Structure 1
Amino acid sequence: MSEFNITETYLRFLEEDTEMTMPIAAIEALVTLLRIKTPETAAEMINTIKSSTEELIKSIPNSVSLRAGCDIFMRFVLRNLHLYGDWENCKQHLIENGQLFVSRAKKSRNKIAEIGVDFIADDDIILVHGYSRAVFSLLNHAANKFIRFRCVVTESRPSKQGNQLYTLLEQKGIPVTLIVDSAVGAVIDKVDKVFVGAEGVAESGGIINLVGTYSVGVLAHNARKPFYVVTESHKFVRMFPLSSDDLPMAGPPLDFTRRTDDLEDALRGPTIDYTAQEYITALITDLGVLTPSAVSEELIKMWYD
Structure 2
Amino acid sequence: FNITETYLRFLEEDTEMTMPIAAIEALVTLLRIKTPETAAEMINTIKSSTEELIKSIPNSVSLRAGCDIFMRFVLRNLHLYGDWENCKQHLIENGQLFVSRAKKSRNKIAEIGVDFIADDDIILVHGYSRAVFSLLNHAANKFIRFRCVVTESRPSKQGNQLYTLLEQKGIPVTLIVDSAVGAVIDKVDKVFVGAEGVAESGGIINLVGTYSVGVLAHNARKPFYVVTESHKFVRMFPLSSDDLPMAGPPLDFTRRTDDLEDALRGPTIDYTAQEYITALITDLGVLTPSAVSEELIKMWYD
Change (3 A) 1:52 1:251: closer
* Equivalences for residues 57-96 of structure 1 within 5 A: 57-96=54-93
Could you list the per-position Cα deviations for residues 94-145 of structure 1 after superposition, in whole angstroms to 9, with x for gaps in the alignment? 1123321011124422322111011101111111112222211110001111
Equivalent-residue separation in structure 1 for 2:33 and 2:12 (angstroms): 22
Change (3 A) 1:104 1:18: closer
Equivalent-residue separation in structure 2 for 1:189 and 1:265 (angstroms): 38
TM-score (norm 1): 0.92
Change (3 A) 1:233 1:180: same
Change (3 A) 1:30 1:181: same
Q: How far is the alpha carbon of 1:264 from its aligned partner?
A: 4.5
Q: How far is the alpha carbon of 1:26 from its aligned partner?
A: 1.1
Could you list the per-position Cα deviations for residues 197-249 of structure 1 after superposition, in whole angstroms to 9, with x for gaps in the alignment? 11011112222120111000001100101111111111111111111123253
Q: How far is the alpha carbon of 1:14 from its aligned partner?
A: 4.1
Change (3 A) 1:63 1:131: same
TM-score (norm 2): 0.92
Q: Does structure 1 conserve the Cα–Cα contact (< 8 Å) formed by 2:4 and 2:53? A: no
Q: Does structure 1 conserve the Cα–Cα contact (< 8 Å) formed by 2:195 and 2:226? A: yes
Q: Does structure 1 conserve the Cα–Cα contact (< 8 Å) formed by 2:25 and 2:95? A: no
Q: How far is the alpha carbon of 1:39 from its aligned partner?
A: 5.5
Q: Does structure 2 conserve the Cα–Cα contact (< 8 Å) formed by 1:128 and 1:153? A: yes
Q: How far is the alpha carbon of 1:62 from its aligned partner?
A: 1.9
Equivalent-residue separation in structure 2 for 1:194 and 1:269 (angstroms): 24
Q: Does structure 2 conserve the Cα–Cα contact (< 8 Å) formed by 1:199 and 1:208? A: yes
Change (3 A) 1:179 1:40: same
Equivalent-residue separation in structure 1 for 2:16 and 2:45 (angstroms): 28
Gaps in structure 2 of 5+ consecutive residues: none
Q: How far is the alpha carbon of 1:189 from its aligned partner?
A: 2.2
Q: How far is the alpha carbon of 1:61 from its aligned partner?
A: 4.3
* Equivalences for residues 264-303 of structure 1 within 5 A: 264-265=261-262, 267-303=264-300
Higher mean Cα deviation, 12-21 or 63-72?
Answer: 12-21
Q: Does structure 2 conserve the Cα–Cα contact (< 8 Å) formed by 1:246 and 1:272? A: no
Equivalent-residue separation in structure 1 for 2:111 and 2:80 (angstroms): 32
Could you list the per-position Cα deviations for residues 252-286 of structure 1 after superposition, in whole angstroms to 9, with x for gaps in the alignment? 53311226664655531100000111001211111
Q: Does structure 2 conserve the Cα–Cα contact (< 8 Å) formed by 1:65 and 1:199? A: yes
Equivalent-residue separation in structure 2 for 1:292 and 1:77 (angstroms): 29
Equivalent-residue separation in structure 1 for 2:57 and 2:260 (angstroms): 23
Report what 1:238 is aligned to. Answer: 235
Q: SS of 2:301's equivalent?
A: coil
Q: Identity over the aligned pairs, expressed in percent?
A: 100
Q: SS of 2:243's equivalent?
A: coil
Q: Does structure 2 conserve the Cα–Cα contact (< 8 Å) formed by 1:110 and 1:137? A: no
Q: Does structure 2 conserve the Cα–Cα contact (< 8 Å) formed by 1:208 and 1:272? A: yes
Q: How far is the alpha carbon of 1:63 from its aligned partner?
A: 0.6
Report what 2:214 is aligned to. Answer: 217
Higher mean Cα deviation, 92-101 or 187-196?
Answer: 92-101
Q: How far is the alpha carbon of 1:16 from its aligned partner?
A: 3.2
Q: Does structure 2 conserve the Cα–Cα contact (< 8 Å) formed by 1:112 and 1:138? A: yes
Q: How far is the alpha carbon of 1:6 from its aligned partner?
A: 4.6
Q: SS of 2:22's equivalent?
A: helix
Q: Does structure 2 conserve the Cα–Cα contact (< 8 Å) formed by 1:14 and 1:20? A: no
Change (3 A) 1:5 1:262: farther
Q: How far is the alpha carbon of 1:29 from its aligned partner?
A: 0.7
Higher mean Cα deviation, 14-23 or 202-211?
Answer: 14-23
Equivalent-residue separation in structure 2 for 1:160 and 1:272 (angstroms): 14
Change (3 A) 1:48 1:289: same
Q: Does structure 2 conserve the Cα–Cα contact (< 8 Å) formed by 1:128 and 1:151? A: yes
Change (3 A) 1:58 1:106: farther
Q: Does structure 2 conserve the Cα–Cα contact (< 8 Å) formed by 1:42 and 1:87? A: no
Higher mean Cα deviation, 65-74 or 115-124?
Answer: 65-74
Change (3 A) 1:83 1:246: farther
